[PDB]
Design an enzyme around this catalytic site. Structure first.
Site, PDB file in Angstrom:
ATOM      1  N   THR A 115       0.915  -1.140   0.000  1.00 38.99           N
ATOM      2  CA  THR A 115       0.000   0.000   0.000  1.00 38.99           C
ATOM      3  C   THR A 115       0.957   1.193   0.000  1.00 38.99           C
ATOM      4  O   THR A 115       2.118   1.074   0.391  1.00 38.99           O
ATOM      5  CB  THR A 115      -0.954   0.014   1.222  1.00 38.99           C
ATOM      6  OG1 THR A 115      -1.993  -0.955   1.021  1.00 38.99           O
ATOM      7  CG2 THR A 115      -1.583   1.422   1.467  1.00 38.99           C
TER       8      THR A 115
ATOM      9  N   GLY B 208      -5.243  -5.571   4.815  1.00 42.26           N
ATOM     10  CA  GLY B 208      -6.460  -4.854   4.683  1.00 42.26           C
ATOM     11  C   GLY B 208      -7.541  -5.352   5.603  1.00 42.26           C
ATOM     12  O   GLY B 208      -8.163  -4.528   6.286  1.00 42.26           O
TER      13      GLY B 208
HETATM   14 NA    NA Z   1       0.210  -3.116   2.662  1.00 39.87          NA
END
Ligand code: NA
Ligand code: NA
Ligand code: NA
Ligand code: NA
Lengths: 293, 296
Positions: B156, B210
């Site tokens: 991310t 997540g």
């Molecule tokens: Na990540």
């Protein structure tokens, strides 16, 4: 062990017709009976909130599943979520179509994938893998909803606490009337449309989707309790903040870990119902306490 | 008026071999320095986090935009969100395909529409309507992640900022995780989880698994703590603390309070990060390997 409770909510929305309250009432009473019956044989919290949200999805009176509002193309698109307060297990679907019970699909994500959230075409893929029936859009669109839209050109939820003291939430909606295609509101978004945790409580919310998301209303509510506010005081803080911070209105239902519960709303009307102690508490307006038929 | 600051991060996963460390440190420097360039040049904290992340999306070594991990079905489906602490205004997208820059679509969702979150088919059509170009799928794809999806038979990027007018913002963007189910959506587009911005507390952008980050609503929990009295680092540690024990999740975050204070922390093995403030670049990957240069 704990005495179980189920609270349900329709929309935290506008005022309803005097004739149609009758109709809305019996929708709340029914889904709440399906939830409380489930708890009454030691069903879990997830069982109750799902079967209760299932009832209102099926009901073409409520803005969820059959009865869903239409998007900007005359079409029903649906979100939902469900959550397990013991281990925070969760499931959510967003912008799904041609299915009857988005809530049942949210449970399937939760129980049979390692993911928590599926959207649109991968969500259809998942449903058909799970052999979920395709139904015609027509079978979800009320003649009514087509009129609500063409002029412009609701949510349903549940929280429960079971015999073992688990909490959970379910929330499902067709969203806001005329929404852009693929708009996701608060419903399938943990902490916005609902949250559930055995160390605090459970919340399902209703009202303006973008506003709920922005102040994290569901998790917010529960912060106030975490600081020792009453379930009444907690829900007055979150919705009042939502109003004064983002000019959004809504409402919410909550049960805390020790079984205290409320429905509060800042909008005109939040239809709701609750069962506890063989007794049913029903309302649409700013409340009958009555036996369980 | 406050001293502006941007903090940027990359994925929160495992060990990184020295050969990859350099381009990653490279890219993080472009990101910090691009965002800062906008803040120094009078710009908004919303403008500035949009800055840091487009560089991270266009840079192949990071799982967002180009070099996003592949879903189980050999395609890119990207998640992004952006928030303005000013009014809590937000935009978001899930399961977007074949565009260079998901965060820009997200900001277009904050500014151009009455909504905060679009997905998949809907997000593709708005992107047609705003003049977002339709770029062939395979140029987003890279051999490293082809190798990886093959071997499977995670990343991310993010920024937070404080601006010279007091305002705060976060942006987050991702490709998800390797061999994810079609249309899997993580934390990165969900406000409160993949990020939270409130001028009256501060802003946070998360990294890591997540599904956990969602379960605990990691970004908003760091803020609740910062409200309660905790310093940014205690709040980082405690929220990060809770995801590990309650839901056995690893990850990271960057945060920046309304008072000027910032921190970057992780419970994963690594997390590429850089801050820029008072004319310096800060950076690192593994815990306190802190190096500071002067930023011209
Ligand atoms: Na990540
Ligand atoms: Na319905
Ligand atoms: Na509603
Ligand atoms: Na990239």
């Amino acid at each position: 062990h704990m005495n179980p409770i189920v609270v349900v909510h329709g929309g935290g929305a506008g005022p309803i017709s005097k004739d149609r309250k009758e109709r809305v009432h019996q929708g709340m009473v029914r889904a709440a009976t399906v939830g409380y019956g489930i708890l009454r044989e030691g069903g879990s919290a997830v069982d109750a909130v799902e079967g209760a949200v299932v009832a209102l999805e099926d009901d073409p009176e409520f803005n969820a599943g059959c009865g869903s509002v239409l998007n900007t193309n005359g079409e029903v698109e649906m979100d939902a979520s469900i959550m397990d307060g013991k281990d925070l297990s969760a499931g959510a679907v967003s912008a799904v179509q041609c299915i009857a019970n988005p809530i049942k699909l949210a449970r399937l994500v939760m129980e049979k994938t390692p993911h928590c959230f599926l959207t649109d075409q991968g969500a259809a893929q998942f449903a058909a893998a799970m052999g979920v029936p395709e139904i015609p859009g027509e079978k979800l669109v009320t003649e009514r909803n087509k009129k609500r839209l063409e002029k412009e050109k609701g949510t349903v939820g549940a929280v429960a606490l079971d015999c073992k003291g688990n909490v959970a939430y379910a929330t499902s909606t067709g969203g806001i009337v005329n929404k852009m295609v693929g708009r996701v509101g608060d419903s399938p978004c943990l902490g916005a449309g609902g949250y559930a945790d055995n160390d605090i409580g459970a919340v399902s919310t209703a009202g303006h989707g973008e506003s709920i998301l922005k102040v994290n209303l569901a998790r917010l509510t529960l912060f106030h309790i975490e600081q020792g506010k009453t379930v009444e005081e907690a829900a007055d803080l979150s919705l009042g903040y939502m109003k004064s911070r983002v000019k959004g209105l809504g409402g919410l239902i909550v049960v805390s870990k020790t079984g205290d519960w409320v429905a509060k709303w800042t909008s005109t009307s939040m239809p709701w119902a609750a069962a506890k102690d063989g007794k049913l508490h029903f309302g649409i307006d700013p409340t009958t306490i009555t036996d369980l038929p």
